[PDB]
Every structure is written in structure tokens, then in C-alpha cells.
Scaffold this active site. Structure first.
Site, short mmCIF file in Angstrom:
data_model
loop_
_atom_site.label_atom_id
_atom_site.label_comp_id
_atom_site.label_asym_id
_atom_site.label_seq_id
_atom_site.Cartn_x
_atom_site.Cartn_y
_atom_site.Cartn_z
CG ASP A 7 12.69 -0.02 2.56
OD1 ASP A 7 12.17 0.53 3.55
OD2 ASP A 7 12.07 -0.23 1.49
CG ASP A 44 8.48 2.97 6.34
OD1 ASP A 44 8.37 4.02 5.66
OD2 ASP A 44 9.06 1.93 5.94
CE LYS A 59 2.32 3.24 1.50
NZ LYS A 59 3.37 2.92 2.50
NE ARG A 62 0.34 -0.93 0.71
CZ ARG A 62 0.60 -2.15 0.22
NH1 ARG A 62 0.31 -3.25 0.90
NH2 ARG A 62 1.17 -2.26 -0.98
CD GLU A 104 5.70 6.52 2.15
OE1 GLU A 104 4.88 7.21 1.53
OE2 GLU A 104 6.03 5.38 1.73
CG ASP A 107 9.60 10.67 1.26
OD1 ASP A 107 9.57 10.98 0.04
OD2 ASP A 107 8.58 10.31 1.88
CG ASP A 129 9.07 0.00 -2.60
OD1 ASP A 129 8.51 -0.15 -3.71
OD2 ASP A 129 8.72 0.91 -1.81
CG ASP A 131 7.42 2.74 -4.91
OD1 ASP A 131 6.84 2.30 -5.93
OD2 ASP A 131 6.80 3.18 -3.91
CG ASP A 177 1.72 1.76 -6.39
OD1 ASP A 177 1.09 0.92 -5.72
OD2 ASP A 177 2.98 1.75 -6.48
CG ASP A 180 1.59 2.30 -2.09
OD1 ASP A 180 1.38 1.41 -1.23
OD2 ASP A 180 2.73 2.61 -2.44
#
Ligand code: CL
Ligand code: CL
Ligand code: MG
Ligand code: MG
Ligand code: MG
Length: 266
Positions: A7, A44, A59, A62, A104, A107, A129, A131, A177, A180
Site C-alpha cells: 500500500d 492511489d 471521504k 477529508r 483505489e 481495489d 489500513d 480495511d 466508517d 471515510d
């Protein structure tokens, strides 16, 4: 003999001065530590087209924080992103390195695991993360630089207050979340959520049984939440929707990525 998937934008925040050489060196050390036959670095680029199509407010918190930066705060972040770009450039000379505008890294990682994970002994995900724990199996684990933990499927309760990936995904769907900007069902924490899942099944099975018996306010809330639950599952069920998330920016883009990954393998 292992696959290591990085990541890469996430790793970049360790450094948040050029840091390209240090960044690449870190990845090399990791590859050694985890006996990585193949290392793939992801980043990303842009914003999640797939998720923004389902939830325009994804998001949004953010984005608001970024918008309220001063011109000088913004200039500094741009510098970081320039150094990160340079880190990815350098990284690309050494390792397969991918970014796809509107997709992302989450994915891309999920898809790689599905596509080529069978060719490796173990898959190591390098991410802070939580996630990414939607990807854990008996042969897929995560390492976090911030917590220093190695995250394994057998330890899912310790980490996430559920016993397996299916439950983790469903719990995220119920709880949303905050980070996000995904709304959850009011009054449902990890305990009640896990309890609901163990009683009624996964979120799709829950939806099929609405309204559920029970007089508690959180049950009334859940009974009103068919739309939210279904949408949230799409937003959080990383393994189910990763292909669709990539294809969202064009089938040709997905086809190119598939070709690229299969080339790396073998
Ligand atoms: Cl395990
Ligand atoms: Cl619906
Ligand atoms: Mg991510
Ligand atoms: Mg994520
Ligand atoms: Mg999250």
C-alpha cells in the site's frame, strides 16, 4: 516464495527532504523480511470513481479538511506528493509499480490477491489500513508499520471483534466508517453488531429478514436501514467489488491491469 503487495501511498505517510531512496530501501528490506519472490507496489491516483458513484459524499470529510488548508499548508502537501511521485518513479525502476487514475489501491490489491495469490506460499500485505483485513485468509496476512503487528485471520477477534472476514465485512457495513464519511446504523457498536451477525447471518441475510424481531431502539434503527446496509456493503466489501471498482474507469483499463499482473506472475 511469497507475494508482497505494498500500500504505497500508505507507506509514504511514514515519511510525512526527498525520501525516494529511503522509500525504495524500506521496500527492499521488507521483501527480504517476508521472503518475497514478487513485490508489487501500489499507489492511489485521483479519487475512487466506483465509490463516489455510489456515495457522492465518500471521504467528503477529508475533502473538507483539504479545502480548509492555507495556501502555504497546501504548497507543503504538494511538495510531499511531488517527493512521493519521485519515490514511485524510482520504485518503478526496481519493482512493478502501479497507479490507476480513479481507482483505489485497496481495489488493486484485492484483485491481485484473487488473480495470482495461488502461485505463492503466503501473501504479505504491507499496509496500516485495517480495511485491508477484508483480504485475510490462511495464506494472506498484513504487516502495519504504525502498530508493528502482523495481522492473521486466526487472530481476527483480537483485532476486529469478529471471528472471520465475512463477519468483518458485514460489521463494517452496519457500523459504517467515520473516517471515510460512511454513515452507520445508530446505536450499534462492535459488540451488538457481532451479536446481530451471529444471530441473523451476514448483511444480505439480515436485509432479507427485515424487519427483525426485537424492541430495542438499535433493532428499530436496523429495520429502517435496508438502503444504507445494501449501499454500505458495496462500499466496504472489498473482495466482492474490486473488479467492478477497477472496471468503473473503463473495461480496457481493467484488461490492461490484468495483462500487467499476469506478466509479473510466472
Ligand atoms: Cl490464519
Ligand atoms: Cl436498496
Ligand atoms: Mg487505501
Ligand atoms: Mg481503505
Ligand atoms: Mg477505514
Amino acid at each position: 516464495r511469497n507475494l508482497m503487495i505494498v500500500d504505497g501511498t500508505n507507506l509514504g505517510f511514514r515519511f510525512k527532504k526527498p525520501f525516494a531512496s529511503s522509500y525504495v530501501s524500506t521496500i527492499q528490506s521488507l521483501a527480504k523480511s517476508y521472503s518475497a519472490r514478487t513485490t508489487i507496489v501500489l499507489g492511489d491516483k485521483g479519487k475512487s470513481v466506483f465509490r463516489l458513484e455510489h456515495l457522492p459524499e465518500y471521504k467528503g470529510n477529508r475533502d473538507e479538511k483539504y479545502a480548509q488548508r492555507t495556501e502555504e499548508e497546501k504548497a507543503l502537501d504538494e511538495q510531499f506528493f511531488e517527493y512521493l511521485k519521485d519515490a514511485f518513479e524510482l520504485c518503478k525502476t526496481t519493482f512493478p509499480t502501479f497507479t490507476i487514475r480513479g481507482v483505489e489501491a485497496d481495489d488493486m490489491a484485492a484483485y491481485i490477491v484473487k488473480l495470482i495469490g495461488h502461485l505463492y506460499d503466503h501473501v504479505w500485505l504491507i499496509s496500516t489500513d485495517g480495511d485491508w483485513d477484508t483480504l485475510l485468509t490462511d495464506k494472506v496476512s498484513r504487516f502495519s508499520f504504525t502498530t508493528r503487528r502482523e495481522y492473521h485471520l486466526r487472530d481476527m477477534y483480537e483485532h476486529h471483534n469478529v471471528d472471520d472476514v465475512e463477519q468483518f465485512i458485514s460489521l463494517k457495513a452496519i457500523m459504517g466508517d467515520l473516517g471515510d464519511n460512511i454513515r452507520g446504523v445508530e446505536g450499534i457498536g462492535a459488540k451488538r453488531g457481532y451479536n446481530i451477525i451471529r444471530e441473523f447471518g451476514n448483511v444480505l441475510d439480515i436485509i432479507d429478514q427485515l424487519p427483525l424481531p426485537g424492541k430495542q431502539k438499535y433493532i428499530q434503527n436496523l429495520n429502517a436501514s435496508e438502503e444504507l446496509l445494501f449501499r454500505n456493503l458495496i462500499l466496504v466489501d472489498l473482495p466482492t467489488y474490486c473488479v467492478d471498482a477497477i472496471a468503473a474507469v473503463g473495461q480496457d483499463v481493467l484488461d490492461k491491469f490484468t495483462k500487467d499482473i499476469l506478466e509479473i506472475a510466472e
